[PDB]
Amino acid sequence: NITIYHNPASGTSRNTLEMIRNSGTEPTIILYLENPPSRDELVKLIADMGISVRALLRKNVEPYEQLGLAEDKFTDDQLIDFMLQHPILINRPIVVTPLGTRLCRPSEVVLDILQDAQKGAFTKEDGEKVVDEAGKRL
Ligand SMILES: [Cs+]
Ligand SMILES: [Cs+]
After folding, report:
1. From the CA of 116, which ligand is nearest?
2. Which ligand ends up closest to the CA of 3?
3. Domain interval for residue 126
4. What is the CATH number of the domain that holds 74?
5. How far is the CA of 75 from the centre of ligand 1 (A)?
6. Which of 91, 98, 117, 129 has the most CB within a 10 Å radius?
7. What is the total count of domains within the chain?
8. How far does CA 109 lie from the centroid of its chain?
9. Looking at residue 120, what DSSP letter applies?
10. Backbone angles phi, psi at 72, to 5 degrees
11. Ligand 1 being an ion, which residues bring their Cβ within 5 A of it?
């Protein structure tokens, strides 16, 4: 049982999704830009990811720029509420599996929390080899 908060316009998110599929399961796909998690769910995700709230903020997007979020003037809860009100601020992809939750940046972080091994070699879209045919992480 796997969930990915996916952005089809994200190379990182595309590579993650294909690595999930290459382990043999089709995840539930949540298009977070349109269907962001609830506040309770986002708080839980962040806790399980083991990263700070700020570390989840995506830079170089309109609300991060115009809300001045680069400056250290915001509590964690202020940032969480910005994320819910402006879901493009939530960096991507977040993946949930029975083993755990990770912000999969870079995409191959997902290999930590996938239960079943990659079924064959995996190469990212840009040709970066990630696992070879034997299953070794390059
Ligand atoms: Cs939701
Ligand atoms: Cs694993």
Report:
1. 2
2. 1
3. 1-138
4. 3.40.30.10
5. 23
6. 91
7. 1
8. 9
9. S
10. -85, 70
11. 38
